[PDB]
Amino acid sequence: GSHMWIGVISLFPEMFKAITEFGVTGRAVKHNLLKVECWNPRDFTFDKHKTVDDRPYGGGPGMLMMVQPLRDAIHTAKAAAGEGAKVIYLSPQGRKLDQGGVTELAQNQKLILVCGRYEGIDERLIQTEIDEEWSIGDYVLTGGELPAMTLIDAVARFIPGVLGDGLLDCPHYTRPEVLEGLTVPPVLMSGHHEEIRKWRLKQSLQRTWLRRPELLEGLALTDEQRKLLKEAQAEHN
Amino acid sequence: GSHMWIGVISLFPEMFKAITEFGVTGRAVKHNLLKVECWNPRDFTFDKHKTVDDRPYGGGPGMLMMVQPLRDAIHTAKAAAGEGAKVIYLSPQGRKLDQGGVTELAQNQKLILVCGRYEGIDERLIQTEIDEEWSIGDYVLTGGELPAMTLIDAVARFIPGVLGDGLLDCPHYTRPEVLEGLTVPPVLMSGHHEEIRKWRLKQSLQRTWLRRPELLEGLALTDEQRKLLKEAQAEHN
Ligand SMILES: COc1ccccc1CNc1ccc(C(N)=O)cn1
Numbered sequence: 001g002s003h004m005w006i007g008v009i010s011l012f013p014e015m016f017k018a019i020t021e022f023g024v025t026g027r028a029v030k031h032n033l034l035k036v037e038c039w040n041p042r043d044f045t046f047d048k049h050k051t052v053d054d055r056p057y058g059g060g061p062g063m064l065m066m067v068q069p070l071r072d073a074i075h076t077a078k079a080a081a082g083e084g085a086k087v088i089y090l091s092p093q094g095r096k097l098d099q100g101g102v103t104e105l106a107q108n109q110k111l112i113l114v115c116g117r118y119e120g121i122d123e124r125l126i127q128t129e130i131d132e133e134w135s136i137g138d139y140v141l142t143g144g145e146l147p148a149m150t151l152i153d154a155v156a157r158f159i160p161g162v163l164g165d166g167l168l169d170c171p172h173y174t175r176p177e178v179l180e181g182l183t184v185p186p187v188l189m190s191g192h193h194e195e196i197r198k199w200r201l202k203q204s205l206q207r208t209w210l211r212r213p214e215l216l217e218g219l220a221l222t223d224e225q226r227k228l229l230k231e232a233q234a235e236h237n
Numbered sequence: 238g239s240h241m242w243i244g245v246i247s248l249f250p251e252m253f254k255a256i257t258e259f260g261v262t263g264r265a266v267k268h269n270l271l272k273v274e275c276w277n278p279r280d281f282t283f284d285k286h287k288t289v290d291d292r293p294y295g296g297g298p299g300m301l302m303m304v305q306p307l308r309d310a311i312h313t314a315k316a317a318a319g320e321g322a323k324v325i326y327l328s329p330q331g332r333k334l335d336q337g338g339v340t341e342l343a344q345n346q347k348l349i350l351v352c353g354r355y356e357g358i359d360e361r362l363i364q365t366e367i368d369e370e371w372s373i374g375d376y377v378l379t380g381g382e383l384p385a386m387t388l389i390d391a392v393a394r395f396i397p398g399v400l401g402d403g404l405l406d407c408p409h410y411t412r413p414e415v416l417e418g419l420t421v422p423p424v425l426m427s428g429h430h431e432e433i434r435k436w437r438l439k440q441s442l443q444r445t446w447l448r449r450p451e452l453l454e455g456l457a458l459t460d461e462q463r464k465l466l467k468e469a470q471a472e473h474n
């Protein structure tokens with residue numbers, strides 16, 4: 001159906017086995033709903049030692065990705081992708097990823113994800129080769145590979161066939177009925193589907209209010225949600 | 238020195254090869270600065286088919302992790318960890334991870350990371366077994382493994398020997414001197430270390446202001462930073 005092709009530029013393509021070989025994403029790859037293809041800048045070097053890093057102009061402690069191997073790898077991935085592929089660079093300086101941003105990225109049938117190492121890539125390559133710069137969160141990692149895999153996993157959930165409202169999820173319970181003295185809320189045993197739906201929605205509203213109140217500010221609550229939230233806040237007091 | 242031990246509870250322990258076998262984190266593991274030990278709930282099942290999921294009370298589309306295998310795996314990891322280990326559950330409902338939160342978590346010499354699959358774990362296990370619940374970002378994934386690896390990588394950077402201010406990083410440049418007509422800022426060639434430091438700081442301030450203005454609100458800028466930021470905003474106008 002709406003399959004997705006993701007090209008990856010990475011010095012450590014074997015890291016991507018974590019998503020291509022296991023779980024829901026591994027099944028998506030096996031079933032051809034998701035295709036992940038990697039190019040390694042090390043394969044585009046020409047010197048004896050296959051050098052992939054370079055020193056920044058102006059000095060400093062860190063290194064950058066060497067331009068020539070990385071640029072050639074990107075160009076090769078773009079040629080394999082054809083037209084319509086969006087090239088994404090993962091960095092702390094990028095647009096912060098959220099579920100809304102995931103749904104936007106999932107609209108692309110083709111993506112190329114550039115995984116920086118060291119202190120990242122040359123600023124001019126961002127200008128000449130990168131369409132969009134994204135961050136998975138306000139923290140620093142040793143490479144863009146984990147952010148790239150996180151993005152792949154999140155967008156894969158929107159591909160039809162891969163899987164089997166602004167609020168945090170409600171609590172969930174399974175067997176057994178009592179666990180270290182803690183019982184399951186009786187409503188979940190009642191079999192009354194409408195009471196269960198309202199209980200879960202009310203719990204999601206209460207949990208969002210208590211834990212992430214700023215998420216509620218970005219929402220236009222329905223009539224039902226306004227009432228259940230008021231009830232939850234009244235019981236809390 | 239300040240080595241770190243991280244126990245992991247996961248149905249897919251082989252995903253963690255992505256951090257234990259490659260790059261800076263793989264070296265940290267090889268050098269015994271970081272130890273990652275995994276327990277798989279599937280090994281704690283007793284039925285013929287090694288069942289690790291269970292149905293939620295109250296119905297619904299999703300499944301939960303089965304309590305008994307997961308609980309036994311957690312208890313085994315806690316016994317291997319000894320005293321002082323903090324047990325962390327990765328979920329979208331958790332505290333949002335940022336670099337400040339990474340530095341807090343890195344203060345622990347021992348961590349146990351519980352990786353949920355399906356719709357997560359029973360709420361009572363969070364109450365009885367989990368010390369802290371964290372999220373790597375406001376998006377949903379197919380498992381907690383990628384969040385757990387992201388956390389491991391971020392905290393590993395604070396372990397002394399693993400590697401070789403609230404603002405986004407400045408642009409960086411490497412060879413060649415001209416790339417598709419784009420030149421390197423002459424100051425970075427000048428060799429004047431003080432001018433380079435001020436240029437980079439000014440660029441970091443300008444970039445944070447243009448891209449993530451809310452990050453500036455949480456900062457008490459130094460005298461030098463206030464001046465360079467004013468200069469950047471004046472040149473922008
Ligand atoms: C200092 O490292 C870099 C510097 C610049 C670019 C890439 C890297 C690689 N590391 C990353 C990558 C992405 C994210 C994120 N928040 O999306 C976090 N870390």
Ligand SMILES: COc1ccccc1CNc1ccc(C(N)=O)cn1
Pocket residue numbers: 327328329352353354355356357358371372373374375376377378379380381384
């Ligand atoms: C619906 O999935 C779950 C539901 C509940 C718990 C765990 C999972 C596993 N998936 C995750 C895990 C963590 C994060 C995060 N933002 O840290 C995102 N997704």
